[PDB]
Each structure stands twice: as C-alpha cells, then as structure tokens.
Amino acid sequence: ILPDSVDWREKGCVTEVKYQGSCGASWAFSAVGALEAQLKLKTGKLVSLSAQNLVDCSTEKYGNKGCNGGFMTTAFQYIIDNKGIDSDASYPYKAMDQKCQYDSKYRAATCSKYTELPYGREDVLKEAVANKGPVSVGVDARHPSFFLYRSGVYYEPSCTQNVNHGVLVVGYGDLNGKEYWLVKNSWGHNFGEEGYIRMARNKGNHCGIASFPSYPEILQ
Numbered sequence: 001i002l003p004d005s006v007d008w009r010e011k012g013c014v015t016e017v018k019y020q021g022s023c024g025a026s027w028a029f030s031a032v033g034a035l036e037a038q039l040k041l042k043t044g045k046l047v048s049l050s051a052q053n054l055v056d057c058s059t060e061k062y063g064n065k066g067c068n069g070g071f072m073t074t075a076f077q078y079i080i081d082n083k084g085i086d087s088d089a090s091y092p093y094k095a096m097d098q099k100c101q102y103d104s105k106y107r108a109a110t111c112s113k114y115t116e117l118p119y120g121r122e123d124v125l126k127e128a129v130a131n132k133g134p135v136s137v138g139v140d141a142r143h144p145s146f147f148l149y150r151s152g153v154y155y156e157p158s159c160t161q162n163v164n165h166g167v168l169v170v171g172y173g174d175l176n177g178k179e180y181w182l183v184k185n186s187w188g189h190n191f192g193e194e195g196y197i198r199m200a201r202n203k204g205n206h207c208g209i210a211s212f213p214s215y216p217e218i219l220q
C-alpha cells in the first residue's frame with residue numbers, strides 16, 4: 001500500500017531550484033536537496049543548505065573532486081563526520097573550487113545516517129520516495145534531448161544505466177498512464193518544467209535513475 005502519486009514540493013519540503021553553472025557540482029546539489037527535505041520534516045523549517053560547503057570541504061577523504069564530480073553518499077558521510085553543514089545563506093554558491101570555509105556558527109543541519117538502495121530497483125525507490133522523502137540519484141544526462149527537454153515524460157532510447165549527473169527525485173506519478181519520476185535538476189528555472197524533469201518510470205531503470213539511489217536522515 002503506497003500512494004499512486006507523491007510530490008514533496010506540495011509538502012513544503014523542496015527548496016528553490018539552483019543553478020550549478022560550469023562547475024560539476026550536481027552531486028552536491030543532489031545531496032543538500034535530499035537533506036533539506038529531512039531538515040524540513042524534523043524542524044518545520046525550510047532552508048537551502050550549502051552545496052559550496054560540500055564542494056570545498058567534502059574532498060579527497062570522501063573520493064570527491066569538487067567541481068570535477070563527487071558522490072552523494074560520501075557527501076552525506078562528510079556531513080556526519082563534520083557534525084554539521086552550513087546554510088547556503090552563510091556559505092553561498094560560487095561555481096568554483098575553493099578552500100574549505102566551514103564555520104560551525106552557521107550550521108543549519110546535521111546528518112545522523114544515510115541509506116543506499118539496491119541497484120535498478122524502481123519499486124524500492126518508489127517505496128523510499130513515498131515513505132522516507134526525496135532521494136538523491138544519478139542519471140545519464142549525456143544526451144542533447146536531456147539538455148533540450150522542455151516538458152512531458154522524458155524518454156531517450158539511447159539512454160544507458162551508467163550515471164553521470166546527480167539529481168533529486170522529489171516525487172512520482174503518472175500522466176495519462178505514462179509513469180514518471182519527478183526530478184529536481186540544478187540547471188536553473190529555465191530548464192524543463194520550471195527546473196524539473198519528469199523521467200520515465202518502470203522502463204528498465206531508464207537513464208540509470210535507480211542505479212545509485214541514496215537518502216540521508218536526521219534522527220532524534
């Protein structure tokens with residue numbers, strides 16, 4: 001028994017679409033995105049968290065290379081190890097690699113744990129999005145059709161399950177029988193449907209959307 005559609009934006013758990021620019025920081029926006037929702041759930045406060053904090057501070061120890069890419073899971077581990085992440089207000093995004101300037105005075109969130117979901121399992125991802133909240137995922141975005149996407153249910157026959165771009169699954173549903181994942185990107189408001197893309201669901205792990213899902217939690 002799961003709901004047929006969910007959209008975590010309607011629950012006030014999704015901050016504004018961000019704009020990564022020419023820095024490969026999608027992993028960091030995916031990670032803060034997922035944690036922003038858990039922060040809202042636990043505290044009632046909706047606050048954008050610092051993607052730049054992760055870019056600058058969750059580096060070699062975490063297998064991450066700032067503007068040259070990273071992992072959402074090891075970004076979560078950084079936040080756990082660091083005992084904090086700064087607000088985006090305090091530590092705003094510059095689309096470049098900088099020296100780590102974390103200050104605990106401006107800590108806006110904490111992270112207690114994270115969970116990695118099994119590869120390709122869109123049924124388990126559906127359960128997680130319904131029962132836990134927005135889920136950080138990777139997709140195969142190396143396709144002109146992705147960059148040019150305007151509206152509708154995205155399907156790309158040449159998509160692979162090898163991911164290269166981090167995004168956030170904030171919901172799911174179906175548009176007249178065509179099932180989709182509701183995805184928040186970090187390419188600004190002029191990408192897709194006001195910064196969002198609806199990507200084909202239950203179509204064989206399309207564009208690797210369920211290849212590497214993960215989500216953080218903030219425990220009492």
Ligand SMILES: CCCn1nc(-c2ccc(C(F)(F)F)c(SCCN3CCCCC3)c2)c2c1CCN(C(=O)CC1CCN(C(=O)CN(C)C)CC1)C2
Binds near residue numbers: 070072137166
């Ligand atoms: C072929 C599959 C490998 N892969 N790719 C992603 C994946 C997932 C999401 C994205 C995306 F798109 F969301 F960012 C991407 S893009 C390429 C990122 N890259 C980040 C390193 C720099 C180059 C760019 C890749 C993941 C995987 C394997 C499992 N994942 C994890 O996060 C867990 C790993 C455990 C072992 N690691 C360690 O670092 C162990 N210690 C040394 C710390 C790496 C992480 C997710």
